[PDB]
């Protein structure tokens, strides 16, 4: 059983929780900017708290992230026109999600080098429904579960590689799992 997919406002933050119904997933909004997820042999889910619309901002995040298998903790968001799904992956489990993309280079931000990848998702779920769209990745080499992400540094580095962003839609500190188990308990803020 899974928490039903849902979106909106909670304690002044935006949140989104989405799953494909697979396995067992329990998403729980907490006070302020906090949320938790526990999951067992999920399908695919993505959930967390943040803002709508996103921006070039410094996002503070802290908490726990305990993937057993493939899961990510990322600044995660969308733009439109063009439609782009982007990830600034601060921690992952046993799978580096850049495997699926093309390596374009690196960016240094907030105390670590990141590896940058572009992937193409063909007829995949999106905030505009089933669609084909680019995916931008910045994957932190020095995994962590607390600190500050300067999203503008990533937007900058992606643009240096010819990767254009559209108009910002939502932007959250997302826990994501794919065919894995685990848990997270995360708090978000911006100064
Ligand atoms: Na669009």
Numbering used by the authors: 29 to 219
Sentences from the study reporting this entry:
The savanna soil yeast Blastobotrys mokoenaii displays superior growth on xylan thanks to an efficient secreted glycoside hydrolase family 11 (GH11) xylanase; solving its crystal structure revealed a high similarity to xylanases from filamentous fungi. In this study, we characterized the xylanolytic strategies of three phylogenetically diverse yeasts with different CAZyme profiles: Blastobotrys mokoenaii (phylogenetically in the Trichomonascaceae clade; isolated from savanna soil), which possesses a GH11 and a GH30_7 xylanase, Scheffersomyces lignosus (CUG-Ser1 clade; isolated from the gut of wood-boring insects), which possesses a GH10 xylanase, and Wickerhamomyces canadensis (Phaffomycetaceae clade; isolated from Canadian red pine), which lacks any obvious endo-β-1,4-xylanases.
We successfully crystallized and solved the structure of BmXyn11A extending to 1.55-Å resolution, by molecular replacement using an AlphaFold2-predicted structure of BmXyn11A as the search model. The structure of the P. pastoris-expressed BmXyn11A is the first GH11 structure from a budding yeast. The overall structure adopted the expected GH11 β-jelly roll fold, and the asymmetric unit contained five protein molecules. Comparisons with previously solved GH11 members from bacteria and fungi show high conservation, even among kingdoms, with Cα-root mean square deviation (RMSD) values of <0.6 Å to BmXyn11A, which could suggest either retention of this enzyme in B. mokoenaii after the split between yeast and filamentous fungi or possibly a recent horizontal gene transfer event. BmXyn11A reached near-maximum xylan hydrolysis levels after only 15 min, releasing mainly smaller XOs (xylose, X1; xylobiose, X2; and xylotriose, X3). The differences in XO distributions between BmXyn11A and SlXyn10A from GX correspond to previous studies, where GH11 xylanases require three unsubstituted xylose units for attack on the xylan backbone, while GH10 xylanases can accommodate more branched xylans. Secreted enzymes such as the GH11 xylanase from B. mokoenaii produce XOs in the extracellular environment, which could also benefit neighboring cells from other species and enable cross-feeding behavior. B. mokoenaii is the standout species thanks to its secreted powerful BmXyn11A, which likely facilitates the rapid growth on xylan.
